[PDB]
Design an enzyme around this catalytic site. Structure first.
Site, short mmCIF file in Angstrom:
data_model
loop_
_atom_site.label_atom_id
_atom_site.label_comp_id
_atom_site.label_asym_id
_atom_site.label_seq_id
_atom_site.Cartn_x
_atom_site.Cartn_y
_atom_site.Cartn_z
N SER A 145 0.85 -1.20 0.00
CA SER A 145 0.00 0.00 0.00
C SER A 145 0.89 1.24 0.00
CB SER A 145 -1.05 -0.11 1.11
OG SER A 145 -1.75 -1.34 1.07
N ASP A 242 -7.94 -2.35 -7.74
CA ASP A 242 -7.52 -2.17 -6.36
C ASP A 242 -8.55 -1.32 -5.60
OD1 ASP A 242 -4.92 -2.20 -4.44
OD2 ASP A 242 -5.82 -0.20 -4.41
N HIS A 287 -8.49 -5.43 -1.42
CA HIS A 287 -7.53 -4.68 -0.61
C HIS A 287 -6.50 -5.59 0.07
CE1 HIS A 287 -10.70 -5.47 2.55
NE2 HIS A 287 -9.60 -5.86 3.17
#
Ligand SMILES: Cc1ccccc1CNc1nnnn1C
Ligand SMILES: *[C@@H]1O[C@H](CO)[C@@H](O)[C@H](O)[C@H]1NC(C)=O
EC number: 3.1.1.98
Length: 341
Positions: A145, A242, A287
């Site tokens: 991330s 995403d 995620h």
């Protein structure tokens, strides 16, 4: 378990001035070292950072960190959970600078918070050299991330640091998970990053900085623009759909306008990866990240991510039956049957 070490140089700090740190589990029979950067968004002004300090304080301070953490996924030492690097030396670097790992600014009488992400990485590397990193053959800088974008921003600086310190034999490589974003148009209607960089004294890789020039450093936070400027080998993991990308795009019985928007997003992401030879990009809405215990389950074209990473290792010594470029071509979330449920 990985054990916490607070940095011996206590001037390299989290946002609130408490010392930064790292969690370490050594494997004395291995010359491989995995340094993982945690993610968790960012903050970009006094008021926004004050809110984060109230209810996301572990991302801004070491005062409440636990003495140990369990290594999971690519950080697991169990071969069944981690077919790739189970015997490596394992390091987890907590994200406590709120700056996408780009900052180099201390607290002062003019700064309520310190933004030191780029300096935290360099100080962790320096202190690990005395704990066995000096004998490494490969240092893999990984992250998820905001930490995946942090890999892209820092891998070449780590390589330069080790060369200048006198360790030319350590091969530095990057693994960027879920940090490859598009500066696209929203479905319903970059500035926060631009403001953040000024607030943080944020730094970007030098070749990318020289292309985009003063005021335009925000461009280097986008994988497809910064990646071609990097010299270290970098493997890119990115879901085609995403969830963090869709959140910023304001996407939440799908009618034609939204169908076309989602299909075009997947096509654009696939296009940006065409010239990325080491990549894993499944057609999933997710995620989920590479430190999850079931990271072994997804496959593209019949090949898992732990296998693709092993094939990448072999390529850095094309290979029959051992591919490294794995991008789905089907155009809708979960058209790959192995997507996380
Ligand atoms: C680089 C970074 C790190 C953490 C959170 C967000 C971002 C960039 N934000 C963004 N811009 N367009 N899509 N996305 C997600
Ligand atoms: C500690 O880190 C700061 C910032 O990187 C640096 O200015 C200082 O020289 C460091 N101290 C030592 C003893 O290396």
């Amino acid at each position: 378990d990985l054990r916490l070490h607070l940095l011996l140089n206590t001037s390299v700090t989290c946002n609130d001035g408490s010392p930064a740190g790292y969690y370490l589990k050594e494997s004395r029979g291995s010359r491989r070292w995995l340094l993982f950067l945690e993610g968790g968004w960012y903050c970009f002004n006094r008021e926004n950072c004050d809110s984060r300090y109230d209810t996301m304080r572990r991302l801004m301070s070491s005062r409440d960190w636990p003495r140990t953490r369990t290594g999971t996924g690519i950080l697991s030492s169990q071969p069944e959970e981690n077919p790739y690097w189970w015997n490596a030396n394992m390091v987890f670097i907590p994200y406590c600078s709120s700056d996408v790992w780009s900052g180099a600014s201390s607290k002062s009488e003019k700064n309520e918070y310190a933004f030191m992400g780029a300096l935290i990485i360099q100080e962790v590397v320096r202190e690990l050299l005395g704990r066995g990193l000096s004998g490494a053959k490969v240092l893999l800088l990984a992250g998820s991330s905001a930490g995946g974008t942090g890999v892209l921003l820092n891998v070449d600086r780590v390589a330069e640091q080790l060369e200048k310190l006198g360790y030319p034999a350590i091969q530095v490589r990057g693994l960027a998970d879920s940090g490859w974003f598009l500066d696209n148009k929203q479905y319903r209607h970059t500035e926060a990053i631009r403001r953040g960089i000024r607030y943080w004294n944020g730094v970007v890789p030098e070749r990318c900085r020289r292309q985009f020039q003063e005021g335009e450093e925000w461009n280097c936070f986008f994988g497809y623009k910064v990646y071609p400027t990097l010299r270290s080998p970098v493997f890119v993991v990115q879901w085609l759909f995403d969830e963090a990308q869709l959140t910023v795009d304001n996407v939440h019985p799908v009618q034609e306008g939204l169908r076309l928007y989602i299909q075009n997003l997947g096509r654009e992401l696939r296009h940006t990866l065409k010239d990325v030879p080491a990549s894993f990009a499944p057609a999933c809405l997710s995620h989920e990240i590479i430190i999850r215990s079931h990271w072994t389950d997804v496959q593209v074209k019949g090949t898992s991510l732990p296998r693709a990473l092993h094939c990448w290792d072999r390529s850095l010594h094309p290979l029959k039956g051992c591919p490294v470029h794995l991008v789905d071509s089907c155009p809708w979330p979960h058209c790959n049957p192995s997507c996380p449920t």
